[PDB]
Amino acid sequence: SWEVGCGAPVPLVTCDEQSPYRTITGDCNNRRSPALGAANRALARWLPAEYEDGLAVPFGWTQRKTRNGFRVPLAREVSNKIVGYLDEEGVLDQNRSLLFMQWGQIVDHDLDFAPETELGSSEHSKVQCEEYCVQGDECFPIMFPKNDPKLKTQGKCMPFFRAGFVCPTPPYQSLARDQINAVTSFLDASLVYGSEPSLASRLRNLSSPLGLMAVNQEAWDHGLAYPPFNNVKPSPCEFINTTAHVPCFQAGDSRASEQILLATVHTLLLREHNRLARELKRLNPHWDGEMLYQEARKILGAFIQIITFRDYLPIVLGSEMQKWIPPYQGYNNSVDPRISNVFTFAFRFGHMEVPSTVSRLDENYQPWGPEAELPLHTLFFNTWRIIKDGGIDPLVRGLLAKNSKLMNQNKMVTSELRNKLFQPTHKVHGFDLAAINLQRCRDHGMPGYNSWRGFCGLSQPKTLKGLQAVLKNKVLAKKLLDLYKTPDNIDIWIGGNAEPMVERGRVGPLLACLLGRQFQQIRDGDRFWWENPGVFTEKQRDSLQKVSFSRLICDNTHITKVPLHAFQANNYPHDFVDCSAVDKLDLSPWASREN
Ligand code: HEM
Ligand SMILES: CC(=O)N[C@@H]1[C@@H](O)[C@H](O)[C@@H](CO)O[C@H]1O
Ligand SMILES: CC(=O)N[C@@H]1[C@@H](O)[C@H](O)[C@@H](CO)O[C@H]1O
Ligand SMILES: CC(=O)N[C@@H]1[C@@H](O)[C@H](O)[C@@H](CO)O[C@H]1O
Ligand SMILES: CC(=O)N[C@@H]1[C@@H](O)[C@H](O)[C@@H](CO)O[C@H]1O
Ligand SMILES: OCc1cccc(O)c1
Ligand SMILES: [Ca+2]
């Protein structure tokens, strides 16, 4: 830390100490160090950043600057040679529902967001990046290799802008550059409520003292609500269909409409808040607008924590879950709650779980209409298919009855993401998420694969033969070394994902360690963790223990047949029960007496 502490962007915020509620920003969770875990601060560095100049220049920036004596391969070349595949047949995960992928994305958005840098709206440099592909300042274009089909139809590169960093936004020459996490590190439903005071208030309904979240006033789903529209233009949800004129949703997190199933789960979560807020007011008529909002917010936060740690993590981490996330032993004010920079790449394992299509299903869980199944690329920034084509129920049924993609060393990332990605402001369904990930690895100054293996106590292969053994795959290891020339240079996103999965899990040993450590930290380092004594009464906890995603579905949609365990692969009718067989959330313990 060249300076003993760089913090010019908001160092301020008075701490309450008497508050039973979290701040919107995450400040004041940790009493000794109140900025820890708060939004718009640097991502934590678990290892020192690795830049070609030691400070800020990404590896790959200068042709003539090697990493460990070898040129780094183009991100898109790695994507084409390693990450892509043609045949979608046989790629699905026979024991994870599509909800498993989807919940991952939700959790991710709760924990981290490193926004692409600001520096200007009215930019000649935007054209310079996109139209001319000239690298400079925050433009760091993804150059196509020779033989790339995209060279024939899309020009010479994909645009790419470097992430924002603290002391923030023009270049500085201090300790190494740290990217910003714009959301709260805590698992706290910041994706529903926001991590900033402007947004958080804009999302609430302050026209009535009921503690409700604002809802769309233009469209309804069989009498159930949608999020408000975002009426700032240009709107990518309008751009993908200028006939329908259906804008993006507005949600605690700016990414909520990135694809239709994310927007779908966001809508469920908004619905749950208002459902909770209405029950609380009925149970506690005296309660004012603020306390309703806050008590509802507190419950929803616990919901996300429980679903995540009880149901989701054990089937991601499998046999490693015990080793990294043992049983909760209480809040620990020494633990660093911040999301680490590497975690934002590790958690991108979910990209390899996204399948190539999305289905709308009817009440018999048969295809909903003649175009029930849609290619995923037509569903980026697509809100019109929700509002104009059956609402949420058909998509939720698909989330329950369809499968996630299985990660596969020879079928890594679906072409829907790898060749067809839509990015707002750019006009085409023509980007490559895997190339973006790799380029972003470099932008953030990530240490390589072997540095992370050492970090996790795992062997550091230096040879082809050693890499074959770690990957349990000769052909993959050989492709990777042909590109990277030393395992020391393999980008963490691809190195971590290339490892065979652990038993009963869906990530390899390296990622399980990285993810495992991070999740242990956001639990043990959270003063408002749901199971921390003082946060919820014992009675409130016994009620919270029975939450489930199936119950979330049942309460907030007109889906009446659900599985007991919604993350595993479930088939209809054999694996589905009526909602009456699913435990309710008993909110009687929130009844507050007075007098
Ligand atoms: C159809 C599904 C998905 C799409 C279209 C999508 C798209 C994207 C895009 C465009 C980015 C920003 C890339 C960059 O500029 O660096 C991103 C980042 C990310 N994605 Fe996804 N993604 C999807 C699913 C998932 C899943 C399933 C997970 C995890 C289980 C996940 C985790 C992440 C994470 C951790 C980041 C980095 C967030 C940050 O700190 O800024 N994504 N994704
Ligand atoms: C048929 C089968 O493999 N069932 C397992 C089940 O034992 C396990 O508890 C569950 C966790 O989600 O994952 C399933 O794949
Ligand atoms: C923008 C918005 O959501 N306005 C709703 C309004 O439609 C509703 O009638 C009122 C009272 O229940 O609560 C407001 O929040
Ligand atoms: C290219 C495209 O997606 N066109 C759809 C069209 O099929 C639909 O009838 C219309 C009305 O919702 O919305 C448009 O966006
Ligand atoms: C009782 C307890 O939790 N002790 C741990 C201790 O092992 C360690 O010093 C630190 C982890 O960095 O967190 C403390 O709270
Ligand atoms: O899912 C992340 C994402 C990606 C691109 C644009 C967005 O607004 C959000
Ligand atoms: Ca959060």
Q: Helices and strands in order, then pairings?
A:
Blueprint: E1 41-42, H1 75-83, E2 92-97, H2 98-111, H3 124-130, E3 142-143, H4 149-153, E4 157-158, E5 180-181, H5 190-193, H6 197-203, E6 220-221, E7 224-225, H7 236-239, H8 260-283, H9 289-317, H10 321-324, H11 343-346, E8 357-359, E9 373-375, H12 384-387, H13 393-401, E10 403-405, H14 415-418, E11 421-422, E12 429-431, H15 433-443, H16 449-455, H17 464-471, H18 474-484, H19 492-498, H20 509-524, H21 538-544, H22 549-556, E13 561-562, E14 577-578
Antiparallel strand pairs: 1-5, 2-10, 3-4, 6-7, 8-9, 11-12, 13-14
Helix pairs in contact: 1-15, 1-18, 2-8, 8-9, 8-22, 17-18
This protein binds protoporphyrin IX containing FE (HEM), 2-acetamido-2-deoxy-beta-D-glucopyranose (NAG) (4 copies), 3-(hydroxymethyl)phenol and calcium ion.
One 2-acetamido-2-deoxy-beta-D-glucopyranose (NAG) is lined by residues 241, 243-244, 384, 388.
Q: Find the count of extended strands (DSSP E, 2+ residues).
A: 14
CATH hierarchy class name: Mainly Alpha
What's the CATH H-level homologous superfamily?
Answer: Haem peroxidase domain superfamily, animal type
Ligands bound to this protein structure: protoporphyrin IX containing FE, 2-acetamido-2-deoxy-beta-D-glucopyranose, 3-(hydroxymethyl)phenol, calcium ion
Domains counted in the coordinates: how many?
Answer: 1
**Main sheet record:** 2 strands, antiparallel
Strand order of the largest sheet: 1-5
Derived from helix and strand composition plus strand pairing, the structural class reads mainly alpha
The global form is: globular
Give the N-to-C terminal Cα separation.
54 Å
* Tally of helical runs: 22
Helix content: 25-40%
CATH topology: Myeloperoxidase, subunit C
Radius of gyration over alpha carbons? 23 Å
**Beta fraction:** 5-15%
CATH architecture descriptor text: Orthogonal Bundle
